[PDB]
């Protein structure tokens, strides 16, 4: 049945889970047994994500536990799915890095290295657009993440800032791998979505135009419409003046080349970082 499994496609270490503070013959997940819990960072539909000490190596993580057992072997594959995709992405210093994964009981556990908070969090604490200092070193350090994504026929479905973890020293990192996609699924927020992606047109493409958005959010302090006249016009080449009236002319000209309807004529994440704006600072 469920006995607690260490989860890795690329099959590494061992299957069996040990830690100082974990005993198997005690009642106690490994979980439970295995790190202090300091609080609940986030929750939602999926589970809960939790900020905590590892008894192994006393560091701070964040651990997402899945809500309840798995419902059967399609629901069981898409999520162990996210552990996959974690790893085709590999080590890069602008995404989310994955320490370990396991199973137990049907719910799947998932410790990444503990982040600061997203990139909407930060928007809510500091209530008003973000200055445009801030906003250029969060859009080079995302598009370095889809790069590397990119470069690997990789595509994450659902850049936005709720996805986006800060760091020191003004960086961030690109994470919830959950919805990639290997070019050759799920939808990802509306808000945020390609307008290609009606027609099935899947593309690293798609990114660009999702981080496009991410930043107008982010630098204009504006919601983004989930449907409708307004859906359709920030897919149409339009930036409304009342939330776009204060940009500078440079990161309007980047925000207009990222939101291209036309995928083909779509800017790459690597033609981006070679303009002198994007160049490290």
């Known amino acids: 049945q469920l006995q607690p499994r260490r989860v890795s496609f690329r099959g590494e270490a061992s299957e069996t889970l040990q830690s100082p503070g974990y005993d198997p013959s005690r009642p106690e997940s490994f979980f439970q047994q295995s790190f202090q819990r300091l609080s609940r960072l986030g929750h939602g539909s999926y589970g809960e994500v939790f900020k905590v000490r ?4 006393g560091r701070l993580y964040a651990v997402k ?8 072997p399609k629901d069981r594959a898409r999520k162990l799915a996210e552990v996959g995709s974690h790893e085709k992405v590999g080590q890069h210093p602008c995404c989310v890095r994955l320490e370990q994964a396991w199973e137990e009981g049907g719910i799947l556990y998932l410790q990444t290295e503990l982040c600061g908070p997203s990139l909407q969090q930060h928007c809510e604490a500091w209530g ?10 969060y859009l080079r350090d995302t598009l370095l993440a889809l790069a590397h994504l990119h470069s690997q026929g990789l595509v994450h479905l659902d850049v936005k800032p709720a996805n986006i973890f800060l760091g020191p020293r003004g960086r961030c990192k690109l994470g919830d791998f959950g919805l990639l996609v290997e070019l050759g699924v799920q939808e990802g927020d509306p808000r945020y979505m390609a307008p ?3 027609q099935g047109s899947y593309g690293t493409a798609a990114d660009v135009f ?3 958005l991410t930043i107008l959010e982010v630098a204009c302090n504006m919601e983004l419409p989930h449907g409708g006249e307004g859906w359709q016009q920030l897919r149409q080449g339009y930036l409304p ?3 776009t009236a204060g940009l500078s002319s440079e990161l309007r ?5 990222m939101l291209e309807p036309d995928p083909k004529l779509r800017a790459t994440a690597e033609a981006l970082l070679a303009l002198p704006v994007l160049r490290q600072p």
């Open 253 to 257: 000209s980047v925000l207009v080349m």
């Open 54 to 57: 590892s008894k192994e190596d």
């Open 210 to 212: 999702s981080l496009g």
């Open 241 to 243: 003046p009342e939330f």
């Open 65 to 72: 536990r899945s809500m309840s057992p798995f419902r059967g």
């Open 128 to 137: 008003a657009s973000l200055p445009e200092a801030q906003v250029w070193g």
């Open 196 to 198: 290609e992606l009606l």
